[PDB]
Amino acid sequence: ASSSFKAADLQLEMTQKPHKKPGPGEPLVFGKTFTDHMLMVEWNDKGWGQPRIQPFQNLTLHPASSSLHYSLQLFEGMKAFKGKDQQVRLFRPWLNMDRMLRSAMRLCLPSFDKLELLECIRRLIEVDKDWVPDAAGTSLYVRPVLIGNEPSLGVSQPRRALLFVILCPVGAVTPVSLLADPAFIRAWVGGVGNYKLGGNYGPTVLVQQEALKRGCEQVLWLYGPDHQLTEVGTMNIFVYWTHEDGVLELVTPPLNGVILPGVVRQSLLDMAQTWGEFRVVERTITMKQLLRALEEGRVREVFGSGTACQVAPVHRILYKDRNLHIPTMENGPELILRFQKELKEIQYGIRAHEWMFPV
Amino acid sequence: ASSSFKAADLQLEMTQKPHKKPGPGEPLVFGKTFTDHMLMVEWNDKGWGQPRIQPFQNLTLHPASSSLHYSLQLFEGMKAFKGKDQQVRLFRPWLNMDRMLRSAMRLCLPSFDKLELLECIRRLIEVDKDWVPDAAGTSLYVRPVLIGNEPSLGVSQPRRALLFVILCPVGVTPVSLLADPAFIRAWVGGVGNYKLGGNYGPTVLVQQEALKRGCEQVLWLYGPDHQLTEVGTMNIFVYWTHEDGVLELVTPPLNGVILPGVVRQSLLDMAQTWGEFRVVERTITMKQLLRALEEGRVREVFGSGTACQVAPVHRILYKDRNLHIPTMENGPELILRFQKELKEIQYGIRAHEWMFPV
Ligand SMILES: *Cc1c(COP(=O)(O)O)cnc(C)c1O
Numbered sequence: 001a002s003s004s005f006k007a008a009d010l011q012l013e014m015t016q017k018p019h020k021k022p023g024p025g026e027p028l029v030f031g032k033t034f035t036d037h038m039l040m041v042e043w044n045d046k047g048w049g050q051p052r053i054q055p056f057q058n059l060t061l062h063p064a065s066s067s068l069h070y071s072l073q074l075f076e077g078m079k080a081f082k083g084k085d086q087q088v089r090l091f092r093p094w095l096n097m098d099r100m101l102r103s104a105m106r107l108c109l110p111s112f113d114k115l116e117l118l119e120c121i122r123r124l125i126e127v128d129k130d131w132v133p134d135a136a137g138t139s140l141y142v143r144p145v146l147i148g149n150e151p152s153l154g155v156s157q158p159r160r161a162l163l164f165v166i167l168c169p170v171g172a173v174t175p176v177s178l179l180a181d182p183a184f185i186r187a188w189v190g191g192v193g194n195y196k197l198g199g200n201y202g203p204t205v206l207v208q209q210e211a212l213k214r215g216c217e218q219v220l221w222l223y224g225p226d227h228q229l230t231e232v233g234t235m236n237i238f239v240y241w242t243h244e245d246g247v248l249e250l251v252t253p254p255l256n257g258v259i260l261p262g263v264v265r266q267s268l269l270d271m272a273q274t275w276g277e278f279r280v281v282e283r284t285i286t287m288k289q290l291l292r293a294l295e296e297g298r299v300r301e302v303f304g305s306g307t308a309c310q311v312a313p314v315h316r317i318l319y320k321d322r323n324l325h326i327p328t329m330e331n332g333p334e335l336i337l338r339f340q341k342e343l344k345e346i347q348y349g350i351r352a353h354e355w356m357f358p359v
Numbered sequence: 360a361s362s363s364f365k366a367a368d369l370q371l372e373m374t375q376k377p378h379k380k381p382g383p384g385e386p387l388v389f390g391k392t393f394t395d396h397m398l399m400v401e402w403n404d405k406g407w408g409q410p411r412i413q414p415f416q417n418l419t420l421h422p423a424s425s426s427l428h429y430s431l432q433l434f435e436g437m438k439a440f441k442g443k444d445q446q447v448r449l450f451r452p453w454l455n456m457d458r459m460l461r462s463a464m465r466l467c468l469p470s471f472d473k474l475e476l477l478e479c480i481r482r483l484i485e486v487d488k489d490w491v492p493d494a495a496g497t498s499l500y501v502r503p504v505l506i507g508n509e510p511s512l513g514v515s516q517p518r519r520a521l522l523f524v525i526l527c528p529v530g531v532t533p534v535s536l537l538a539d540p541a542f543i544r545a546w547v548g549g550v551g552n553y554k555l556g557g558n559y560g561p562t563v564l565v566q567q568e569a570l571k572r573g574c575e576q577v578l579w580l581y582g583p584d585h586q587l588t589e590v591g592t593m594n595i596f597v598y599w600t601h602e603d604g605v606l607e608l609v610t611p612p613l614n615g616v617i618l619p620g621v622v623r624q625s626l627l628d629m630a631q632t633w634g635e636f637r638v639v640e641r642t643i644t645m646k647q648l649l650r651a652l653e654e655g656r657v658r659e660v661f662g663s664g665t666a667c668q669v670a671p672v673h674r675i676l677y678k679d680r681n682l683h684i685p686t687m688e689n690g691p692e693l694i695l696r697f698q699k700e701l702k703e704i705q706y707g708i709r710a711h712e713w714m715f716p717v
């Protein structure tokens with residue numbers, strides 16, 4: 001069933017025609033430019049096949065592939081950074097490997113050895129090393145994907161699967177406005193919003209378009225009768241404020257089933273707790289608490305965290321037909337800038353850290 | 360172009376390699392046998408391309424296709440029946456087209472003319488007409504799909520899409536259900552009321568959990584009061600004598616967690632035209648079912664859907680207790696009546712406006 005593929009059995013097929021690299025100064029739009037190679041591993045009832053780094057090419061899928069009919073698909077997202085010394089380093093990839101496996105088990109997709117996938121990805125990034133940019137605010141986005149590939153129309157356990165990894169060079173704090181409407185629910189307790197599955201994203205496109213029509217940039221996902229702040233778009237939410245007791249704290253919603261356990265989220269919690277300058281807690285945040293904190297002048301900063309945008313400040317929330325100004329930007333944004341500075345130092349290798357995996 | 364593809368612009372490529380084809384062939388397993396041809400239509404920001412009936416072949420997709428990363432995918436399911444006179448007819452396909460368009464709009468996928476897609480599908484079934492079986496209880500399952508095919512990694516409205524249709528020749532038996540409140544299929548404010556791929560993938564593990572606990576399918580419960588919503592991928596109906604003493608047929612309302620089934624609607628239409636009992640759409644709770652079973656007021660409980668048509672329920676495993684549902688010892692009179700009437704309409708024994716000739 002699952003004996004896993006090995007990096008030692010990795011086959012390499014180099015490209016005959018290397019693609020046109022963007023070049024210095026050229027704008028790198030998110031997920032539009034792809035590298036020369038990709039990783040590919042196939043699975044069936046007998047087990048996993050040999051992993052291979054092959055040229056970037058199209059996938060050949062049967063029209064009845066369960067990935068297209070029943071969303072037997074999941075993905076991951078992590079970044080690789082290149083420092084001044086030309087050394088490429090991956091940001092906490094072990095955590096993405098842990099999350100990917102959990103997503104695989106939830107969709108009855110094959111298990112794999114996390115360290116073997118990590119080594120195969122390390123080798124893929126090494127082959128396409130020249131594609132990783134070295135300018136400030138730039139990186140390489142790594143996109144691992146595991147899909148069901150059963151050539152049948154029954155809603156069941158796939159007897160075939162495909163694991164592939166693609167790479168994208170991405171370029172270079174901008175404040176965002178949010179729509180907070182209780183009618184749109186992203187995830188439910190006992191659901192699958194805590195897993196990075198394709199199914200959680202497609203239905204959010206219309207909600208984002210609805211945010212744009214009301215003058216907002218992103219969506220503030222509310223949950224329950226008390227209107228709990230859960231996520232901001234595809235990012236985890238943090239609030240830096242003076243709490244009701246009078247203590248300065250950094251709060252983010254707890255992992256109770258409706259929150260995707262973000263790697264950047266975990267990193268910000270680790271970093272803030274190591275400093276020991278304020279209280280760091282995982283607690284439910286309601287719109288009433290936020291509103292009362294805003295009118296009492298207790299809110300300092302509100303922001304989103306995730307791989308793509310890193311740390312994204314919030315300046316406005318549209319809730320119950322009222323525009324609420326969030327004092328982020330006016331408060332520095334001190335905490336955001338400190339988090340960004342320390343993350344940039346770790347990521348680009350200015351400061352050595354166990355969080356970075358060298359390629 | 361401009362708004363929709365036209366069936367008048369239909370291109371036809373016949374197969375140079377026709378495959379297998381069953382006897383009969385004895386076990387006609389659902390979705391494992393495919394026909395010789397498929398319909399394919401592409402879309403981009405400039406409009407729809409020319410529709411094409413081509414041989415059954417693999418799809419060629421870019422690794423960054425939005426259908427594989429963000430589940431910008433939807434599907435439909437309807438059946439084509441071959442009668443005595445060898446005439447093939449589709450069951451209320453207009454309703455499936457209406458639902459497919461609603462699903463498309465929910466995922467910001469391109470709009471299309473419903474009657475033009477129906478005509479393109481009619482032409483596809485005509486090309487593969489010999490694949491439709493004529494035996495009792497058999498049919499041709501039609502599977503339309505619309506996917507996002509944007510070669511980018513941003514979660515946004517696709518600038519490219521693909522619409523394809525594949526066909527499957529397919530062939531009263533009671534079922535057992537697992538009723539555990541821990542499993543949630545859909546939520547109010549969600550997308551369980553649309554036939555999107557995303558609603559099915561997470562159910563695979565739950566179905567495996569039903570099988571290892573001794574049941575054949577899942578009874579989907581919702582809320583603190585344990586509302587019976589769906590039976591697997593079928594709508595649920597309860598035929599009973601209500602607390603007020605009135606004989607009624609009830610099915611959960613379209614409040615966001617129920618998929619508006621074509622068979623569901625057809626059973627509601629038929630039962631309403633008979634006028635022999637009350638026919639309503641209302642929430643059904645496990646407490647109400649238990650109370651009715653104890654008082655001997657339940658006659659029949661069943662699921663409705665395209666694949667299994669009408670499926671009787673005999674057992675529900677709830678709170679680690681096996682609850683016997685008396686469906687089979689009450690005939691099942693209503694199920695058999697629905698099945699008889701559906702068969703007469705489907706196989707062309709009686710002419711009806713619900714059937715679309717191919
Ligand atoms: C990807 C994602 C995040 C952030 O996770 P990171 O691992 O930090 O990139 C947060 N919320 C949702 C809904 C996400 O999809």
Ligand SMILES: *Cc1c(COP(=O)(O)O)cnc(C)c1O
Pocket residue numbers: 436554589591592593594618619620621622623663664665666
């Ligand atoms: C397809 C489906 C139904 C039934 O719809 P029909 O149009 O009658 O085939 C019911 N519930 C779910 C969840 C479904 O996917």
